[PDB]
Point group: D3
Amino acid sequence: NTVNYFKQKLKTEQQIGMWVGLADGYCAEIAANVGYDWLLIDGEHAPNDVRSILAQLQSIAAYPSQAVVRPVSGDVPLIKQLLDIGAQTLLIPMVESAEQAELMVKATRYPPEGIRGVGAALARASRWNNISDYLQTADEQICLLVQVESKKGLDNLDEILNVDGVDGIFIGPADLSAALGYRGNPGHEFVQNIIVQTIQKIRAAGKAAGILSADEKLAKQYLELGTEFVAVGVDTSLLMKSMKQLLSKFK
Amino acid sequence: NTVNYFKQKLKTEQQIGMWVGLADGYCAEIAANVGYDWLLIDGEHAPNDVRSILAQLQSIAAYPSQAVVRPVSGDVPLIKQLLDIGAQTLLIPMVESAEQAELMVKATRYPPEGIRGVGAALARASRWNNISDYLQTADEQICLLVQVESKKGLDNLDEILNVDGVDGIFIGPADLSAALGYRGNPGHEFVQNIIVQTIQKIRAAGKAAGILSADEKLAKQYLELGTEFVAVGVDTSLLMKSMKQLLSKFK
Amino acid sequence: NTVNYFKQKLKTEQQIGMWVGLADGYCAEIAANVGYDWLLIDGEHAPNDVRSILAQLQSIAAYPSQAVVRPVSGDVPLIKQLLDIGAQTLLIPMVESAEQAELMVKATRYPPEGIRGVGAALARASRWNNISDYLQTADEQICLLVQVESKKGLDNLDEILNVDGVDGIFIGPADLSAALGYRGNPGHEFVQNIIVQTIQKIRAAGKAAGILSADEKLAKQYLELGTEFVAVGVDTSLLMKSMKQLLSKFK
Amino acid sequence: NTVNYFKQKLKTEQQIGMWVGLADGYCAEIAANVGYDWLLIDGEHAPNDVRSILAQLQSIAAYPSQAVVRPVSGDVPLIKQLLDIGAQTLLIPMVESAEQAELMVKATRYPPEGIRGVGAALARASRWNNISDYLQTADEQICLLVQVESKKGLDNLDEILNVDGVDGIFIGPADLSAALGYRGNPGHEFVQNIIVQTIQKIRAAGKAAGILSADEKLAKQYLELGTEFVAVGVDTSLLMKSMKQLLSKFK
Amino acid sequence: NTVNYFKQKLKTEQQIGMWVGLADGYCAEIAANVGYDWLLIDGEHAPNDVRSILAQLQSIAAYPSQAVVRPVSGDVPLIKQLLDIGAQTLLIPMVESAEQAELMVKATRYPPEGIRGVGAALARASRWNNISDYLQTADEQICLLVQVESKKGLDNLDEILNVDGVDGIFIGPADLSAALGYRGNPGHEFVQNIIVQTIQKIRAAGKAAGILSADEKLAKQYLELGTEFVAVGVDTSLLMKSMKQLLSKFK
Amino acid sequence: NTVNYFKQKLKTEQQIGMWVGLADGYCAEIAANVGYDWLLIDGEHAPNDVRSILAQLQSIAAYPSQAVVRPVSGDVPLIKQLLDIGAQTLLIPMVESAEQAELMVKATRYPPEGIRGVGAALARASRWNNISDYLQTADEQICLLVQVESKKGLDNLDEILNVDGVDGIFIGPADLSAALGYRGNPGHEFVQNIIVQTIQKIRAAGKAAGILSADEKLAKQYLELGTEFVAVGVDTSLLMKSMKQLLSKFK
Ligand SMILES: [Ca+2]
Ligand SMILES: [Ca+2]
Ligand SMILES: [Zn+2]
Ligand SMILES: [Zn+2]
Ligand SMILES: [Zn+2]
Ligand SMILES: [Zn+2]
Ligand SMILES: [Zn+2]
Ligand SMILES: [Zn+2]
């Protein structure tokens, strides 16, 4: 019902993901019909706000695909809002220290242990108190993933990996390749060797490892490493690419 | 500037089209970047209204691709609205007689010759009277296409083809195959032979012939017949198909 | 998955309904959490269009409650639109002859038997062709209800009740009491005696009978008569009434 | 509080009007702060639907300016929708016979006298039944204006003017000049003499005469003739003209 | 006309409030027709942004109910935006020090005394400079309420209560009970005794005390203590509860 | 095609600007038809969010007028969003140190030199990777303006003017006159003398100077000083003023 199946499957299987940046309920529903294990509603790099993410959670809710929401940043009030509209799995960009990851764990948990604002009567998260024990049980079905995607993030990796309540570390190859001076070129061996080592350290610390690659060969290679959550394409890239390919057959 | 290049090119070249049923400005802009000769904003089979079609005309306006709007039906007031938001080419579904096609010609022209409501001060069509002689020159850049896609439409084809101000007849293979008792199966020889004969009669009467086929082989065959406007795919079908194909490489 | 359970339950049980006139995907979701057998998305008397009805179908789709859509009128093109966004049950207002009810049956069925426009590729109804045999099986799961709520409707009742493909006749007590010279007073014995006789005639002809009443005693009495689909309240009335009642405890 | 002051002032004073075609609640509020006697929300020549018109009724409702809504056509179901969202004055375009004007009167009145669909519980018009006697009193505060703006309209002027419940006849100079073969040149003596005689006949039959002119000299001449409701400008034309004039001071 | 009646009544009477988290202009208008002294537009726990809050200010503005806006956090730029759209009373969540309360006072006042960004020409607050002296008089009609709802808030209660320009302290029972280790159980004696003492200290320092309770007995007890602004219910909770109660009469 | 002409013209000519605070794609299009060198889409003082700014970039993109976006504040994540939707010129309000101006430069540039988040695949800025070398060439076409409009801004003026990558300093006369104790009276000689000296210092340090004034005489005087970018009016002010002026001709 509101069991976080993406959260349970981190320990259980490898989950194939689709990036959703078309930023509307109608597009999110089309993606939701395909059968991806997870759909990333991108609040960071697509023109989304709280209301458009809600619309996309409502579309996707009818379908087995599990929703993961990336906020624009690790903003504690915005995390409060996204949890209340019922986003059960968050991906926080650009996480750079154990202290920042601990703030994000606290942002996802109610007082007295955390700092998640309490407003269950008003929340789709509680179905407006129609889930009777929401305030006692919400935490069990919240999944927190953080992105390592900067030099400082790699510099604090072991420390982030010992933070209790971080379920998964996701590697951002676009941000990380740029930070490493290989902007636009994550396929470089220098970047790939750091990514592979990063995945191994994530899985050796008992956390789930995730990544995005539209490159089919790199995606399969990440899956052979045991990477637990692999996004394998992007709705905007697939729409543009297929329309271009179709046109080139007639130019 | 507001020259209807789709209209001029009916006499000049074969125009490759993309069907736009994602029904928002953002999606219409992605399609507009590909380089299709024309984009069909579907008011009949996608969840569009006047305001969403406006948003999509505004997105597309920055790009060389020419916009064609299909209204839900040959409704004279709705044609008035779509012309005022600045749609220069309309495709009218389910046209079934010379009398209906003549009503549609009149719907696209100002009195005293036509019945297009006059409200140029308020219209994006006139850029709010920033096009000085709009009321004298609008008609020159309006293009009217009608669909033949029923038994009655085929029964009135010669009569529709002698109506002055019909620039083009578009064949709807989904509606026509269903009307012919081959619903879901336009690829049948019975349907194809009627389509090919219909195209030849359209071009022999000096009008532009158009059609949609997502089948690449049928599309190329329609282009070899000299069909002037051929839509060759559908944004919703390309997004769904590419996301499915991508997923099957990992299932 | 896309089985019309409301349609099946017409022969099987009494279905308790809630009127949805708050005209937004968020309000439709709240209503969908209660457990009503059916939700009437009101496109006649609430400020809805095709796009707002789509948002409310997507909200409701995640919940067992079955959606029924009332269009503003028996308009064939608008029926086409509502079917393509995936409304499986329609309630047509102000139906007044067998001829009009037969037009509505045809409006819900594909050619060659009906006049439903074919555009399955673009439709949420087909899940963008992800339901493989949609064009062959669509009609099995479409349910057509018609409203008798005028003197001319009652004058054509036996004729409407012999129209094959009318699944149900719903009585509109507001429109009907007004047509009978008892505007705002459907509780009058003159009106109630016609309502009861009408329900009996509907069930004697083997069709489902429906009605709305916010009066609990009248709703229970219609349920004791065997009325198959009974709406029992209206979201706007319940929001307003409960807010007034609460304020009167403090004035 | 829901007294139709525009309707009362038709017998009492000359009411100065502003055309609103910017088609959003924010623009309609700006216009509402100026102090016009009336504001014409234009559903015919501005990109409005029922929901955009509702938003503009809500903006305007805090201000003394009275709202008048022009629907796209004399469509009975659309009239029903506009009345239910709480539009108390309607301006019907392109009215051409006593029969059509009588249909419009009926479209604004409840059965048994009229054909206005009854659904007061759901309507902003009744404030969701918070106006207790709404169904008994609604018609007293409904004002029906019809546009005469075609040859056929002028050919049926005396017949339209004897139709009980037509409160006002509005002359459309753009449509009328077009219909008379002077498209874009309403200023012509041929057109002006017909407008003047038309106004005198409207007032001799004891109905309110209305018109729009953005020409100040023509507006004042129509006011000296006793024209009861004169729109004197258009928000889109004032926005465009003021921005152009400002720029020419710097080119 | 733009007099902040909520602000004046803080010294004068006890004001009864309704929480508005249905987050659209249509729902806010329904609530506005009931006669609550105030309406809390909830930007913290309902899916609102600046534009949705503007729509709800516009709906409510026609009605005597006074609007109060809760922003998501004490963010100075967001406060600037909410003031400019014309919100005259703000409820700042989670205020924890005299320093933070002083920052919020400054955020509501123009330089040189405050840090409210100046842009009156563009603002609904000034009615686009149609309120002539707006920049000189704005602060007289701005009301600042701060929430005490954490241990740190209670630890800084005396300091917050000596901050000039804090008009009211609102107690958040959900956040406060959570912070005290009684999450979801504000009814506990431990929590109630802290709330009662907190209210008495707020009123002894000559500020207005406020609270929300949906429990009628607790609401009336807070009113007997002299609490100046008591919210007594939540629109989402009333909608859900009334629809559930109605359904259980038929299960 | 995506050349920043506003940026090039900073070294080349004086650019006449219009302030856009009507906050919608339709109004932004009207303004885009006039021929202003630049249009300021105001995300600080008009009710805009990322999605409404996107709609207005898409409207404006078809016209030669160059778009400049003011965010609500110098927020690094919000700058990321506005750059990804394809805003090429940003005006940062209330910049007060070289440290803050350097943060803003970094916020507009990709790593490793800056901290702009990398997500080109999803961005209108890259046209969804249809601009092939976007990640290599993006910064060449990004223009950063900062506002000096506080005492601390003037106290850090020389330091801000030595920050490499600040293309322009814009003076905010409303915020600055208020900070100087002359709120609502920027026309005072004390204020004007600081504005003139500030412009001279900006141009002496080889940066572009900008300002807004709706006062024609002050705008011409700033143009005679060589001010590179001068906004000369505000859409809301021009809509309101022209509507009031028109009404005063009839009162
Ligand atoms: Ca709409
Ligand atoms: Ca928004
Ligand atoms: Zn990243
Ligand atoms: Zn068709
Ligand atoms: Zn009815
Ligand atoms: Zn007209
Ligand atoms: Zn709280
Ligand atoms: Zn400023």
